Amino acid sequence: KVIATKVLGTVKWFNVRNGYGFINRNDTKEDVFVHQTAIKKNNPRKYLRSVGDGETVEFDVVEGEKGAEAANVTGPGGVPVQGSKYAADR
RNA sequence: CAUCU
Ligand SMILES: [Zn+2]
Description:
Layout: E1 2-15, E2 20-25, E3 31-35, E4 56-64, E5 67-74
Antiparallel strand pairs: 1-2, 1-4, 2-3, 4-5
The protein binds zinc ion.
The structure holds one RNA strand.
PDB class: rna binding protein/rna
Keywords: OB-fold, RNA BINDING PROTEIN-RNA complex
Assembly: dimeric
C-alpha cells in the first residue's frame, strides 16, 4: 500500500549487519526506514543486499509493519543500487 | 524489520 511513488532519497546510514537503515527523502527531508529485503535492484557485484551512505536512491514509501518503510529501492531510473562500503565484491 | 555506529 503506497504513500508516495518514485521519490528520490539520500541514504542516511545503513548497517549491513543489522540489515536495515534510513533513507532521507530529497522529497520531504523526512527519514524513511529501509530493510534489506526492500532492495529491488541490488548491485550484482556485491554478495549481500545493502545501500551505501550518501547514495541516491529511487523508492516508494509504503505502509509497513510498524509504520512507513521504503520499498522497491533502486538507483535513479531503476538502475541497480550502489550498495554499502562494507558489503564485499564478488 | 525501527535511528545502528
Ligand atoms: Zn517491513
